[PDB]
Enzyme design. Structure first.
Site, PDB file in Angstrom:
ATOM      1  N   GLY A 155       0.807  -1.199   0.000  1.00  0.00           N
ATOM      2  CA  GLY A 155       0.000   0.000   0.000  1.00  0.00           C
ATOM      3  C   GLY A 155       0.843   1.254   0.000  1.00  0.00           C
ATOM      4  O   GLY A 155       2.035   1.199   0.151  1.00  0.00           O
ATOM      5  N   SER A 156       0.184   2.399  -0.097  1.00  0.00           N
ATOM      6  CA  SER A 156       0.866   3.680  -0.185  1.00  0.00           C
ATOM      7  C   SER A 156       0.144   4.739   0.662  1.00  0.00           C
ATOM      8  O   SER A 156      -0.984   4.544   1.099  1.00  0.00           O
ATOM      9  CB  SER A 156       0.963   4.086  -1.650  1.00  0.00           C
ATOM     10  N   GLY A 157       0.846   5.811   0.974  1.00  0.00           N
ATOM     11  CA  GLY A 157       0.280   6.865   1.779  1.00  0.00           C
ATOM     12  C   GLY A 157       1.070   8.109   1.518  1.00  0.00           C
ATOM     13  O   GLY A 157       1.641   8.259   0.441  1.00  0.00           O
ATOM     14  N   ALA A 158       1.215   8.931   2.549  1.00  0.00           N
ATOM     15  CA  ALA A 158       1.865  10.240   2.432  1.00  0.00           C
ATOM     16  C   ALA A 158       3.398  10.213   2.636  1.00  0.00           C
ATOM     17  O   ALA A 158       4.058  11.253   2.477  1.00  0.00           O
ATOM     18  CB  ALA A 158       1.186  11.278   3.353  1.00  0.00           C
ATOM     19  N   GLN A 159       3.947   9.037   2.964  1.00  0.00           N
ATOM     20  CA  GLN A 159       5.404   8.781   2.853  1.00  0.00           C
ATOM     21  C   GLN A 159       5.569   7.635   1.833  1.00  0.00           C
ATOM     22  O   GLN A 159       6.415   6.732   1.955  1.00  0.00           O
ATOM     23  CB  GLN A 159       6.088   8.512   4.214  1.00  0.00           C
ATOM     24  N   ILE A 189       5.059   4.448  -0.617  1.00  0.00           N
ATOM     25  CA  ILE A 189       4.909   3.009  -0.619  1.00  0.00           C
ATOM     26  C   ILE A 189       5.434   2.336   0.688  1.00  0.00           C
ATOM     27  O   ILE A 189       6.289   2.887   1.412  1.00  0.00           O
ATOM     28  CB  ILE A 189       5.540   2.443  -1.926  1.00  0.00           C
ATOM     29  N   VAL A 190       4.721   1.281   1.074  1.00  0.00           N
ATOM     30  CA  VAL A 190       5.040   0.507   2.222  1.00  0.00           C
ATOM     31  C   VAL A 190       5.055  -0.889   1.620  1.00  0.00           C
ATOM     32  O   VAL A 190       4.116  -1.280   0.941  1.00  0.00           O
ATOM     33  CB  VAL A 190       3.933   0.632   3.319  1.00  0.00           C
ATOM     34  N   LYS A 203       8.804   0.799   5.424  1.00  0.00           N
ATOM     35  CA  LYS A 203       8.347   2.102   4.946  1.00  0.00           C
ATOM     36  C   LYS A 203       9.583   3.007   4.756  1.00  0.00           C
ATOM     37  O   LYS A 203      10.441   3.002   5.563  1.00  0.00           O
ATOM     38  CB  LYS A 203       7.441   2.685   6.020  1.00  0.00           C
ATOM     39  N   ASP A 249      -5.906  12.301  13.364  1.00  0.00           N
ATOM     40  CA  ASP A 249      -6.002  11.834  11.972  1.00  0.00           C
ATOM     41  C   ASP A 249      -6.321  10.368  11.817  1.00  0.00           C
ATOM     42  O   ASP A 249      -5.777   9.730  10.958  1.00  0.00           O
ATOM     43  CB  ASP A 249      -4.665  12.115  11.296  1.00  0.00           C
TER      44      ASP A 249
HETATM   45  F1  FMY Z   1      -3.160  -4.707   3.818  1.00  0.00           F
HETATM   46  C1  FMY Z   1      -2.406  -3.842   4.472  1.00  0.00           C
HETATM   47  C2  FMY Z   1      -1.465  -4.206   5.462  1.00  0.00           C
HETATM   48  C3  FMY Z   1      -0.742  -3.142   6.068  1.00  0.00           C
HETATM   49  C4  FMY Z   1       0.367  -3.159   7.021  1.00  0.00           C
HETATM   50  C5  FMY Z   1       0.683  -4.152   7.872  1.00  0.00           C
HETATM   51  C6  FMY Z   1       1.697  -3.914   8.813  1.00  0.00           C
HETATM   52  N1  FMY Z   1       2.307  -2.731   8.962  1.00  0.00           N
HETATM   53  C7  FMY Z   1       1.955  -1.788   8.024  1.00  0.00           C
HETATM   54  N2  FMY Z   1       2.661  -0.659   7.938  1.00  0.00           N
HETATM   55  C8  FMY Z   1       2.188   0.471   7.437  1.00  0.00           C
HETATM   56  C9  FMY Z   1       1.232   0.449   6.447  1.00  0.00           C
HETATM   57  C10 FMY Z   1       0.871   1.727   5.941  1.00  0.00           C
HETATM   58  C11 FMY Z   1       1.330   2.973   6.452  1.00  0.00           C
HETATM   59  N3  FMY Z   1       0.847   4.127   6.036  1.00  0.00           N
HETATM   60  C12 FMY Z   1      -0.058   4.203   5.085  1.00  0.00           C
HETATM   61  N4  FMY Z   1      -0.286   5.534   4.916  1.00  0.00           N
HETATM   62  C13 FMY Z   1       0.579   6.207   5.725  1.00  0.00           C
HETATM   63  N5  FMY Z   1       0.540   7.596   5.841  1.00  0.00           N
HETATM   64  C14 FMY Z   1      -0.352   8.358   4.933  1.00  0.00           C
HETATM   65  C15 FMY Z   1      -1.096   9.506   5.659  1.00  0.00           C
HETATM   66  O1  FMY Z   1      -0.645   9.694   7.015  1.00  0.00           O
HETATM   67  C16 FMY Z   1       0.791   9.668   7.166  1.00  0.00           C
HETATM   68  C17 FMY Z   1       1.431   8.317   6.759  1.00  0.00           C
HETATM   69  N6  FMY Z   1       1.304   5.367   6.510  1.00  0.00           N
HETATM   70  C18 FMY Z   1       2.298   2.902   7.477  1.00  0.00           C
HETATM   71  C19 FMY Z   1       2.737   1.673   7.938  1.00  0.00           C
HETATM   72  N7  FMY Z   1       0.996  -1.973   7.093  1.00  0.00           N
HETATM   73  C20 FMY Z   1      -0.915  -1.828   5.650  1.00  0.00           C
HETATM   74  C21 FMY Z   1      -1.941  -1.507   4.781  1.00  0.00           C
HETATM   75  N8  FMY Z   1      -2.063  -0.185   4.349  1.00  0.00           N
HETATM   76  C22 FMY Z   1      -0.748   0.239   3.772  1.00  0.00           C
HETATM   77  C23 FMY Z   1      -0.437   1.696   4.074  1.00  0.00           C
HETATM   78  O2  FMY Z   1      -1.659   2.417   3.950  1.00  0.00           O
HETATM   79  C24 FMY Z   1      -2.840   1.947   4.681  1.00  0.00           C
HETATM   80  C25 FMY Z   1      -2.544   0.676   5.434  1.00  0.00           C
HETATM   81  C26 FMY Z   1      -2.667  -2.515   4.146  1.00  0.00           C
END
Ligand code: FMY
Length: 330
Positions: A26-30, A32-33, A48, A144
């Protein structure tokens, strides 16, 4: 020799060789993760990339906070950092920070799509309120929270990904933030109301198409606010709200009918009542009328999970020094 590079999305991740099979998650404001596999620990992790976090004040204060408070805001319901690293050799060449976390099976978006189950929803909400309670205990008011930054393992364990705001999409932000009229701890309660109502509705509660349309979509549903709420709006913003039409809103029964909840039982009947009464206490415009985190944990829909046991601004270069020295500690 410890590092290798791989394309991730539009970017390049350069990571320690222990991290293998990088797959966008997935992706966000920093950006791709990635999911990856940690050979040295033999498990899956999420990685990340902070690209030039010291680049400006807002990126820098955010990266710096994330890096320090992950060391003391310990939580059951707040995600944890396994590793932090940069591929650069010195301060002079320093560029990017990689944050490694435990891998979770999904975000809340994915869980919201599922059918309404009262045990699952109260469990999730309990954990969220608890994670938030702990954010507050450590002096962090998030502001947020949204389904996309809350993640859940397959056994319904939940973790808040990050610490939120400093200090188009405003679907989950509290009325006191939109209007920039100051906030207290129960600002995070409003985001929990939006999230719970979305679990019931399987549709974004306040799906605005602009900063303006967001505010109407909230007043159309809950009704126009009282005179005392108004008088606290900074003078330009006070006129836009007060001078609009008056909206009456909808009762919480008409906002969340019987038909949205299970039924043909007295359990289900009781639970539906409890859900809506909690909705009606979280989804309140005026922060002075809105239930607190503690009272929300004592609420009968939630309390069945209780378990007797339980600011400064810096130069770009000084930010880079600060962040870099934090990366070199663990
Ligand atoms: F199916 C999935 C499993 C997991 C997953 C599992 C473990 N750790 C993990 N680590 C992550 C994942 C995502 C982010 N951020 C996403 N956006 C931001 N922003 C944007 C705005 O605010 C400031 C930073 N951080 C940070 C750490 N992500 C994650 C998701 N999505 C992937 C990311 O997006 C939604 C969750 C889906």
């Amino acid at each position: 020799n410890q590092f290798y590079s791989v394309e991730v999305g539009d970017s390049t991740f350069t990571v320690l060789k222990r991290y293998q099979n990088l797959k966008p998650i997935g992706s966000g404001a920093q950006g791709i993760v990635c999911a990856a596999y940690d050979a040295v620990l033999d498990r899956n992790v999420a990685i990340k990339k902070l690209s030039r976090p010291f680049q400006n004040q807002t990126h820098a204060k955010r990266a710096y906070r994330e890096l320090v408070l992950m060391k003391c805001v310990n939580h059951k319901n707040i995600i944890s950092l396994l590793n932090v690293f940069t591929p650069q050799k010195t301060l002079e060449e320093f560029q990017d920070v990689y944050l490694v976390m435990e891998l979770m099976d999904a975000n809340l978006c994915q869980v919201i799509q599922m059918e309404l189950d009262h045990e699952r929803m109260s469990y999730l909400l309990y954990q969220m309120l608890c994670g938030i309670k702990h954010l507050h205990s450590a002096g962090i008011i998030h502001r947020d929270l949204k389904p996309s930054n809350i993640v859940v393992k397959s056994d319904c364990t939940l973790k808040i990904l990050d610490f939120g705001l400093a200090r188009v999409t405003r679907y989950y932000r509290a009325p006191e933030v939109i209007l920039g009229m100051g906030y207290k701890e129960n600002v995070d309660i409003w985001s929990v109301g939006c999230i719970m109502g979305e679990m019931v509705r399987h549709k974004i509660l306040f799906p605005g198409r602009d900063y303006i349309d967001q505010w109407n979509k909230v007043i159309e549903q809950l009704g126009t606010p009282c005179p005392e709420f108004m008088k606290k709006l900074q003078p330009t913003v006070r006129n836009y709200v007060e001078n609009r039409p008056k909206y009456a809103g909808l009762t919480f029964p008409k906002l969340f009918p019987d038909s949205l909840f299970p039924a043909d039982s007295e359990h289900n009947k009781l639970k539906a009542s409890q859900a809506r009464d909690l909705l009606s206490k979280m989804l309140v415009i005026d922060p002075a009328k809105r239930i607190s985190v503690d009272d929300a944990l004592q609420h009968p829909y939630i309390n069945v999970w209780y378990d007797p046991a339980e600011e400064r601004e810096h130069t770009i270069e000084e930010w880079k020094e600060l962040i870099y020295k934090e990366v070199m500690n663990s």
